[PDB]
Amino acid sequence: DATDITIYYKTGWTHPHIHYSLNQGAWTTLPGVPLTKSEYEGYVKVTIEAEEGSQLRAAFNNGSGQWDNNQGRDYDFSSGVHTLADGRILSGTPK
Ligand SMILES: OC[C@H]1O[C@H](O[C@H]2[C@H](O)[C@@H](O)[C@@H](O[C@H]3[C@H](O)[C@@H](O)[C@@H](O[C@H]4[C@H](O)[C@@H](O)[C@@H](O)O[C@@H]4CO)O[C@@H]3CO)O[C@@H]2CO)[C@H](O)[C@@H](O)[C@@H]1O
Numbered sequence: 001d002a003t004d005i006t007i008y009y010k011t012g013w014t015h016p017h018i019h020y021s022l023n024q025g026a027w028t029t030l031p032g033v034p035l036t037k038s039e040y041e042g043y044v045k046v047t048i049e050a051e052e053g054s055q056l057r058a059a060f061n062n063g064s065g066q067w068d069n070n071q072g073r074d075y076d077f078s079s080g081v082h083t084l085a086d087g088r089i090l091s092g093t094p095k
Pocket residue numbers: 010011012013042067068069070071085086087
């Protein structure tokens with residue numbers, strides 16, 4: 001069973017960050033943790049260390065105060081691998 005929370009994110013932002021609360025804990029210090037270039041063009045990625053059965057709530061930003069926050073609701077990610085593209089989350093890698 002999956003542990004870490006791994007996220008692929010479709011963006012053209014050069015300095016994308018993920019700001020998050022893991023398992024309802026503290027929010028990261030703004031602007032959060034950078035995502036890194038992925039193996040897929042147009043996607044960056046990050047793996048957030050977590051235990052089995054974890055979930056985090058997240059808002060993305062461009063490292064200079066522009067946001068992607070799911071209509072103000074934030075995005076929910078669970079343990080395992082998911083891809084966020086254009087506001088929609090699916091399991092696994094870029095389609
Ligand atoms: O590469 C082809 C495309 O390149 C350009 O798109 C870029 C944008 O310039 C970037 O700003 C960024 O897009 C941001 C977007 O600016 C931001 O609002 C946000 O959009 C989300 C939205 O929050 C969400 O609720 C849902 O509607 O999906 C949106 C994305 O569709 O997040 C974006 C991602 O960080 O990155 C895109 C490339 O991914 C150019 O403008 C496009 O016309 C061109 O096709």
